[PDB]
Design a protein around this ligand. Sequence first.
Ligand SMILES: OC[C@H]1O[C@H](O[C@H]2[C@H](O)[C@@H](O)[C@@H](O)O[C@@H]2CO)[C@H](O)[C@@H](O)[C@@H]1O
Ligand SMILES: OC[C@H]1O[C@H](O[C@H]2[C@H](O)[C@@H](O)[C@@H](O)O[C@@H]2CO)[C@H](O)[C@@H](O)[C@@H]1O
Ligand SMILES: OC[C@H]1O[C@H](O[C@H]2[C@H](O)[C@@H](O)[C@@H](O)O[C@@H]2CO)[C@H](O)[C@@H](O)[C@@H]1O
Ligand SMILES: [Cl-]
Ligand SMILES: [Cl-]
Lengths: 450, 450, 450
Amino acid sequence: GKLVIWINGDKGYNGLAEVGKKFEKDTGIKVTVEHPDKLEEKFPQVAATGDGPDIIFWAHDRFGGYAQSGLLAEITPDKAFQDKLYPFTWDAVRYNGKLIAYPIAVEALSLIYNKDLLPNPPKTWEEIPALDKELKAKGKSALMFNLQEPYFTWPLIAADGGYAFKYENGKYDIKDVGVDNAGAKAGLTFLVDLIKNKHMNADTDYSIAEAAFNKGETAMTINGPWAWSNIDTSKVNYGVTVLPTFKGQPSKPFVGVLSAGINAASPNKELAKEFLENYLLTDEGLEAVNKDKPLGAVALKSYEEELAKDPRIAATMENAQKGEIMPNIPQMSAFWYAVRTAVINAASGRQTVDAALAAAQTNAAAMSLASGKSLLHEVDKDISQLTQAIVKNHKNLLKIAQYAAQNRRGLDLLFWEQGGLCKALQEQCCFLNITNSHVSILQERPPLEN
Amino acid sequence: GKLVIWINGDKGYNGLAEVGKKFEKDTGIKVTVEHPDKLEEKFPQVAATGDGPDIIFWAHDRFGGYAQSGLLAEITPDKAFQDKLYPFTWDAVRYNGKLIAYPIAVEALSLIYNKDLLPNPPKTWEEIPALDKELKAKGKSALMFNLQEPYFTWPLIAADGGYAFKYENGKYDIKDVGVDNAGAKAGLTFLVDLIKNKHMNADTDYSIAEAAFNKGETAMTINGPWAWSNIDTSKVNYGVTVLPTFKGQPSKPFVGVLSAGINAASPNKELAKEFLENYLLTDEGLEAVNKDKPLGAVALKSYEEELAKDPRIAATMENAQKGEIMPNIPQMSAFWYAVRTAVINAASGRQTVDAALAAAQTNAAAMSLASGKSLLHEVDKDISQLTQAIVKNHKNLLKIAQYAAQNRRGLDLLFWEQGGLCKALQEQCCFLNITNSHVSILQERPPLEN
Amino acid sequence: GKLVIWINGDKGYNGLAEVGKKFEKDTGIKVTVEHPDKLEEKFPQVAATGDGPDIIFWAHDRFGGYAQSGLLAEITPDKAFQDKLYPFTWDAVRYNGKLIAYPIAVEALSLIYNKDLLPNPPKTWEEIPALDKELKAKGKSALMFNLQEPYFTWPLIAADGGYAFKYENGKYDIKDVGVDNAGAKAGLTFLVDLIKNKHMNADTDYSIAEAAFNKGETAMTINGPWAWSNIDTSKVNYGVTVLPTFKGQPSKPFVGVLSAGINAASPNKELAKEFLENYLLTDEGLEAVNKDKPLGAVALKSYEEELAKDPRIAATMENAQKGEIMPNIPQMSAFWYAVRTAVINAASGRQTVDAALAAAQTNAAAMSLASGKSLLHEVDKDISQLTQAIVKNHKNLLKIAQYAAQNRRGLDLLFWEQGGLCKALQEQCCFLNITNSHVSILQERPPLEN
Ligand SMILES: OC[C@H]1O[C@H](O[C@H]2[C@H](O)[C@@H](O)[C@@H](O)O[C@@H]2CO)[C@H](O)[C@@H](O)[C@@H]1O
Ligand SMILES: OC[C@H]1O[C@H](O[C@H]2[C@H](O)[C@@H](O)[C@@H](O)O[C@@H]2CO)[C@H](O)[C@@H](O)[C@@H]1O
Ligand SMILES: OC[C@H]1O[C@H](O[C@H]2[C@H](O)[C@@H](O)[C@@H](O)O[C@@H]2CO)[C@H](O)[C@@H](O)[C@@H]1O
Ligand SMILES: [Cl-]
Ligand SMILES: [Cl-]
């Protein structure tokens, strides 16, 4: 009989906490916003047991999976309301020919540079290397951004050719991935060469890249609206514009439409519908959240009209224009996971651009029972070994125990006219009651081939 | 040169032990019947190594898999003998266009109620809730049955729509499952609501549900022929009739034809053929087993004629009539496993009806090497941790040992004119020979990514 | 700026070490040959990280996989050079319609017998049993060979029908395997019957079978050119001829074209091209390696002309003629692995010919997330158990520690006018600083279902 919302801790939550009050005293219903880590992973797990938030906030790309796993309820926006929001963002939230989430805003990474250290930014990726040179001599760097999430480097990977799944005739092809073609390699190798050439680090993430640009330690960065807020507060004269090109090709970023979905396990299913339909998705609702952390190109037509006239937003849309709309299909988590590994491995040097990118593709396929078996049998040789080790420790323990007991025996004899050892020290007596049941249980332990 | 049969401990084994004697002294060949737990799982494992019984008894549904795994021999019933048994039960035991087992009897769950506590039983599922109310007030309950095996609750899941695989044009479609559609959810949610509303328990199984109906603690129950025996012995006036309806739809139970198969690793392959063809599948053979535990609608035409005129049997057939014939395809074990998990999870509340039922479906598909890899790598982070723990224990052990040795040192000095410690206590000396080889082996331990 | 080659330790490496010198002083570039165990497995792993050899030597069958994993560079043999080598061996090294390795020689197992113990060899498999009888009476055996690698017994498995993948219309069909058909079983059962009948052992490998034939302990053996060298040195009058027939059918051996590939991670990519194109693949290059360990039917036309006139080579080609060319497709490692398991299991009796051969086939398919899950959950019940065991050991350790400390306490009291225990023994004091951090870490340990 309440209402709980979940949003990314990197978005305008306190701003949503406000619209969360408008609902409370104007409806009485207590709204509560939460922002946990690994949100996209947590929800599906807690939601699966009937727990979790009534409303979930995340990009549309991973909703199809939550829907496939049957975790949310189909929303029912009255044919009228559907015309308050842009049609293209409605599709982004329509899975299996049905609506599964309320689009909130359109996001697209952009190129943020500090006009005070770089009045004129680079129009090409190819020149950042030599540009970083000049700045490194001055103490700072040229470009810094999160290298932990494929989301950021992907725009470069797609630039010269890379692509998730081919959208063949209004239908994405799962057997048609393109994470390991020419364009792909090209992009990744360049990015890596950047780290290889000390222009970039790899242990670098979000808080690391964010704190650096904001401290003026770097001239460039790649992010989305939500960031702008913290830069303003940092009094650094920044500028938002189109992303650099690669091999003459514009960086193709993956665009996502942040959405609000309704936990199928939710009892307050209408409370939500009305909170989003009549409280959030309003010009004054989108605004409160925006004052907290820029949403970008909101879906509400009325609000986008006086938001689109802003350069930071115009550039975000040009970027999304240059990019592609993320797919819905449940095969995203995999895809994304595949690319996270490639990028991290290739960058960390644990893999090669050619090797990493290949794995990504080939691995998107089914593993034989054989491997599962081999895997199985393998872990056995393993577990078994831990056992004997454990088992052995027990015995030795015992050998030590008896040894101790014996010594203690001689003591009691020395302190006999005292009452043995414990009585002569006038202290609580100790006791070697030693027993390890699991020791045996682990020996019986049937084979894992069952 | 002998002969061994395996049957479920819940069926008429001692009755088969008798026909097992008719074979012995009338052929000399010693027959032996066994009934182990997890029979359907055990056989494939022991049979795989050439061990196990010459003859196996279980429902036809899982024989295709034993045949696929190449565990049984094709039977050779002479075109004449095939007309002693009902044609429809012959199909149930024909895989890949070949015969793999001898059908014994047709089984179909029914509704058993105690006429003395409920003269008139419920014709609908929807009324058991309120009916359980009246009885709970009297001390007993309304319905109780095994909730550990999908077999029992399935009739409800299929009732309003659920289905294993769609039989498209004389061919079952593996890509066409129906464990997560409307009818499915409907049924499961109701069943769960029954437990949710304290009308039913979930930790409840066979022996629990069987002992309750037989003790008169409950008015209803769902089972098959084999059960009737123990009720008779319990002097409870029971009645067997059609299963209740759900949403106006009759509970569709999965019918199985208990069969006898021949271990391909069997040397006494003809001994079997003749034991089943000329000793078991005879009116007097089926009868002996029947006196032990009701087989149901046997396959032997002659015996079914004077068995079908029995209400308990008429109702069993009406039930099977209302239901569907179980598929042969090796993809049953999976399917069944999928539903066992759904039902147990949904009931125990560990999952939701919508979440559980979905898993069942989506999981019937292939997992990426990625997951296998992720899984792999994951278990590593794990195993490794156990190591260091183990490893650490060893060291501490040693620290303790030396500590002990030292103390012992001072003792020998106190009891020096005695011969040290051991000599003064005049007892076998203890010894700290401490060594854990596996400790190192576990350190070397290559990564699991190989 | 160097150059490293990897070849099997069972081939002519020192011979290649020589041609490795011709390159050095005639180019200055230092060449180094290595021969590690599990080469085919090692390379893909080290090559994946950018390490490993610039050139890899192994049969063509597993190159497609290295290419699929993107581990080698496409070679560029000038249209002219391609006519120095036999066209059929060029195909063997062409994957995805591109060249990935330089063919070196064509290999095909043969039948080696000691003319001095068996002037006339068996033309059929069926007679070795009774022939082994006569010889066993004389102290020796009839046939001995490596039973650890499917490569050797495969010629028998394919003889009467077995086959990897069906080559349908210039295209191998992955869904069309034939490791579990009639011919297959036939062959395997016979082979096994050979061991079952004490004519053959199963713990038998290469060094075991090689040392026996060379010591004159056996009259026959199955191997390839590389072997001949060691027999010559052993002064045993051997003979190389066609393989025995099975059920009237000639043993169909799998032929491989030993090839040299170029690590895609290689900086000396041209150094290689020139080492193989102008130094190795020359009549004098092939020769140096040949003096070390027979290559067989080399690919260099000029050298094959005066090599083919040799009986050992004529017979090798007749054998390959009777056999089939190994496929390129990455699905070989699996296939091979599948057959290694079948043969070892069937032979060791851990499985039956019918059961083992089936697994091989059915397992070449995808495993459900279910199994992965079941597997997962299963390992949990496992890991968890090891924990509590470990955990328990810790506690007991502690109980022992305190016990020890206490005893020590009484000692210090006995040796008080000495300075306690440590001071009376005038030795470094011991210390029970006991702490197992992982103990807790392992308790927190989230479930593996994440
Ligand atoms: O990097 C993989 C990740 O990419 C996208 O997530 C973005 C999200 O859309 C943005 O709104 C912002 O919060 O940052 C995320 C990356 O940190 C996908 O939407 C997401 O599913 C995927 O895992
Ligand atoms: O619950 C899954 C289970 O269902 C069927 O097994 C029945 C069997 O047919 C009956 O004869 C009786 O013994 O009880 C079983 C359930 O306990 C399937 O035949 C079986 O394969 C499946 O696992
Ligand atoms: O037994 C499986 C194994 O077979 C073939 O390997 C042969 C190789 O071709 C020969 O040149 C020689 O070295 O011995 C090997 C078997 O020990 C396949 O080429 C190989 O991939 C496969 O694993
Ligand atoms: Cl002690
Ligand atoms: Cl331990």
